[PDB]
Design a protein around this motif. Sequence first.
Motif, short mmCIF file in Angstrom:
data_model
loop_
_atom_site.label_atom_id
_atom_site.label_comp_id
_atom_site.label_asym_id
_atom_site.label_seq_id
_atom_site.Cartn_x
_atom_site.Cartn_y
_atom_site.Cartn_z
N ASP A 1 0.81 -1.20 0.00
CA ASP A 1 0.00 0.00 0.00
C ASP A 1 0.85 1.27 0.00
O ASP A 1 1.92 1.31 0.59
N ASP B 1 0.48 3.77 1.59
CA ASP B 1 0.56 4.28 2.97
C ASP B 1 1.36 3.36 3.90
O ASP B 1 1.04 3.20 5.08
N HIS C 1 2.29 0.15 8.53
CA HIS C 1 1.18 0.48 7.64
C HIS C 1 0.33 1.52 8.34
O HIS C 1 -0.21 1.25 9.41
MN LIG Z 1 -3.40 1.04 3.46
#
Ligand SMILES: [Mn+2]
Lengths: 258, 258
Positions: free
Chosen positions: B102, B104, B212
Motif C-alpha cells: 500500500d 501508505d 502500515h
Molecule cells: Mn493502506
Amino acid sequence: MTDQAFVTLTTNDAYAKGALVLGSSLKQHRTSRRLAVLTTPQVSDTMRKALEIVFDEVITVDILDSGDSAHLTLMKRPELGVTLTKLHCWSLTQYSKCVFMDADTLVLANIDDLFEREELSAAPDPGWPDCFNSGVFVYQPSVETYNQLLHVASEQGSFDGGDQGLLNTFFNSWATTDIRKHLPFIYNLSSISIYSYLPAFKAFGANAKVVHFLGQTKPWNYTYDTKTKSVRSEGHDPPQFLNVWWDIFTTSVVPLLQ
Amino acid sequence: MTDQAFVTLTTNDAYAKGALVLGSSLKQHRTSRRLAVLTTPQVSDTMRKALEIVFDEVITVDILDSGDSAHLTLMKRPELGVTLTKLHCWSLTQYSKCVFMDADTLVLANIDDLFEREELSAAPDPGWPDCFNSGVFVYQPSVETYNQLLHVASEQGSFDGGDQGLLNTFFNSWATTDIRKHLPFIYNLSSISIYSYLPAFKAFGANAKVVHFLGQTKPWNYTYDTKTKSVRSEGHDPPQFLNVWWDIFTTSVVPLLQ
Ligand SMILES: [Mn+2]
Ligand SMILES: O=c1ccn([C@@H]2O[C@H](COP(=O)(O)OP(=O)(O)O)[C@@H](O)[C@H]2O)c(=O)[nH]1
Ligand SMILES: O=c1ccn([C@@H]2O[C@H](COP(=O)(O)OP(=O)(O)O)[C@@H](O)[C@H]2O)c(=O)[nH]1
Ligand SMILES: [Mn+2]
C-alpha cells in the motif's frame, strides 16, 4: 464423557457472576463434557454454593498457603497472583482434555467440537494477532507442563503482567507452527473489536460462537433495566452481547442466587 | 533480479507522496528486486516525473477508458474504482513474483525475504484476525487470476467496499490453510494497533519491518516542523513512526520534488 471438561476461574464474587453466566450458557447449549471451576477462599460462601449448583466440580485453590505448589513463585512475583491461580487448570489431571475459558466469556452455540484440537489451540488476539488470546484455549492437564509454566513464570515473568504474556512466551511456536492450533476468531470474539474493522463484523459476526468481554469493563459493571430488557446507558456512559449476558443472568442466575 | 518486484498504487498526488516515501525506504534498505508503481491520469505531471526517478517502472492504468479490461465491471460497481485499479498488479506479467504494498506503508528493514512465500501470503488484520490485511501481500501475476478477481468483484462485490473485502472473499482459505501463507505481523504492523495491546508492542514492536498507516489519517495529513524534527501536534490534534515517514520525506523526497 467424564474425562473432558470446560475449565474456568474466579477469585472473587465479581468474576463469579461471570462464571455462573458462562456455566449456564454451556449447559444451555447442551455440552456433553463436564464443567469445572477453580475458585479461591476469597469467594463468598453464597457464591460458592451457587457455583456448586451450576458446575459439575468446584476446586478450591489457595496460593497464599505455603503448601500450594505455586506458593514460592508468588513470593518472587507478588504481582502474578491471579495468573498463578489460573495455571492450576493444568493441575486438573482427573481430566484428559480441557478447554479453559475466562470467566468473562459467554457461549452462544455448542462448541464441543473444540475438543478435536490439541494443546495448545487458541484464537488470535486483535491488536497483536501473532499472540493468541488466552481466554479460550484447548489444553492437556499435566504436572510436567504445569511445573514448566511455573518455571518460566519465575525465570522471566510475563511481558504483559498477566497470564496471556506468560502462556504466549511458553507456547511461542503458536504463531508460526501448525494452522490447526489456530482457533477461528468466532471461538473467542473480542467484544471491543466489533468497531475496529466493522465491515468484517457484519460479514462474519453472526457466526459468533463465543463472546469474550475483554478489557477493563465487564458485563457486571453495568446496570440492567429488567423492564426494557437492555443495559442501562444513562449519564456519561460511552450492546446485543451485553444483553445476551444479562438475559442469561436475570433469567437463569438471579433465581438461584442469594 | 529483474523478474521480481515490489508493486504499489497511487491514483492522486496525496498517495503519490506516500508511494515516493515507500519507494525511497525500499531503496534505503537495499532491495535487490525492482520497484514498480501503478498510477492513473489523475496523477500530476510533476508527481509522475518524481515517481519515474524513484521507481524502476511506472505503469499508467486508466479504467475510465472503455479499452481497459476492468472497465465494464466499474459500470456495474461504480464504487470499486480504486479497488479495480489495484487488482491490475496481477496484470504485471512481466514479473513472476511480486509483493504488493500500500502507498501508505513504510519499510524499516530489508524485507526481500518475503519473496520466499507463495501466492497468497499476507499478515493478519487487527480487529478481525481471520481476515488478512491487503496492504502487504505476496502474489503471482497472472491474467487468469486477474480475470477471476474481476469476476468475483462483479458477481458479489466486496463486503467492505474496497479491495481487502474482495481479496479475502477470493482467497478465503488463508485463515485455515497453510501457516506459511500467514506473514508475521511485523511485516504489516498497523500503526493504530500500537495501543490495543500495548504490552505486546513493547515486547515485539522493535522488530518492526513494515509500518502500515492504516485508517482515515495518513502521514501527509499532518504538518511537520522541520526544526524540531517531529510531527506537529498543536490545537485539537488527538509518533516515532510518523516521524520516520516525514524524515524520509523531508530528506529524500522534498529535494527531488517540485
Ligand atoms: Mn493502506
Ligand atoms: O481479579 C481477577 C481477575 C481475573 N480473574 C479470572 O482471570 C480471567 C482473566 O482475566 P480478565 O478476564 O480480567 O482478562 P482480560 O481478558 O480482560 O485481559 C478472568 O476471566 C477470570 O476468570 C479472576 O478470577 N479474578
Ligand atoms: O484514493 C485512493 C485510495 C487508495 N489508493 C491506494 O490504495 C491503497 C489502499 O488504500 P488505503 O491505504 O487508503 O487503505 P487502508 O489501509 O487505510 O484501508 C493505498 O495505500 C494506495 O496505494 C489510492 O491510490 N488512491
Ligand atoms: Mn478475559
